[PDB]
């Protein structure tokens, strides 16, 4: 006439860290953000746990991307050669050469800006997500010196000595 409830088991015997996906230098967490509130040793806010849940998902996607691609650690002021696929033109491959004028390091949302000048048409700027699958390769080919951001902005507005390659290859 007595019904005993079921007690859940422990996933990792004698291990105090669940083993969630985090960056190498970050101290390891002690819980899984998707675990139900009822089964937690510490009852932390749902709102704070949802922020931690998104960080874990971002790191999982970043790990998969790094296994697929290997790009160099370029900086602002370097000249780059970028291989891209044009989905509009039946997924054809082209190679672009230009100067890197802006770089944002924001995890999975990282991006950079590529600048080039043509013989008659003038300057042309592109904004490219770094983790976009359309990009196939990136290489460093040179460097352009600048003093500060103001100097770099003046150079962009006044198109000069930025005509590495006149047209796109392939």
């Amino acid at each position: 006439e007595v019904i005993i409830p079921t007690i859940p088991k422990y996933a990792n015997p004698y291990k105090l860290t669940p083993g969630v996906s985090q960056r190498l230098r970050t101290p390891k967490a002690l819980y899984e953000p998707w675990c139900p509130s009822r089964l937690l040793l510490k009852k932390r806010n749902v709102r704070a746990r949802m922020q931690f849940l998104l960080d874990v998902l971002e790191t999982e996607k970043e790990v998969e991307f790094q296994k697929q691609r290997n790009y160099p650690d370029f900086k602002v002021g370097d000249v780059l050669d970028v291989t891209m696929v044009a989905a509009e033109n039946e997924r054809k491959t082209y190679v672009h050469r230009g100067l890197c004028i802006q770089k944002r390091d924001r995890g999975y949302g990282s991006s950079f800006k590529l600048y080039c000048v043509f013989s008659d048409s003038g300057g042309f700027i592109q904004h490219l997500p770094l983790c976009m699958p359309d990009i196939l390769d990136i290489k460093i080919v040179g460097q352009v010196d600048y003093k500060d951001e103001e100097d770099l902005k003046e150079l962009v507005e006044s198109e000069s000595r930025e005509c590495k390659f006149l047209d796109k290859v392939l």
Binding site: A87, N89, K168
Partner: protein
């Protein structure tokens, strides 16, 4: 994103140099961009094909406002330019000094895709 009554630079060899938008076609909204056809008035021309004071049709080829692609990237130019067209839909010149973008891969711009010097695709 060009509102009405904006000034444009002509990048063909028909003779016109400066035009002003005076009208739109259809329902594009409050502004127009690359790939749309507008009505313009010629302000400065040096040639026999066209003269100042006339009204012509034109197509936007370059703009400084970001142009977005489905993959999340975008690009920008450093000028606003257009190409004059005839009532039949063909250019009034035979040489365009501009960078053609993906908008003109469409079948209706075959003539422009032939007379343009540099193409991004």
């Amino acid at each position: 994103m060009l509102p009405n009554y904006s000034f444009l630079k002509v990048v063909d060899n028909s003779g016109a140099k400066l035009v002003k938008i005076i009208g739109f076609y259809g329902h594009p909204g409050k502004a127009v961009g690359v790939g749309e056809v507008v009505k313009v008035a010629i302000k400065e021309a040096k040639g026999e094909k066209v003269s100042a004071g006339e009204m012509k049709k034109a197509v936007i080829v370059e703009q400084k406002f970001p142009v977005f692609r489905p993959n999340g990237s975008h690009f920008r130019h450093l000028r606003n330019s257009c190409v004059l067209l005839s009532e039949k839909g063909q250019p009034l010149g035979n040489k365009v000094r501009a960078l053609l973008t993906y908008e003109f891969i469409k079948p209706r711009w075959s003539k422009l895709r032939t007379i343009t010097t540099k193409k991004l695709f």
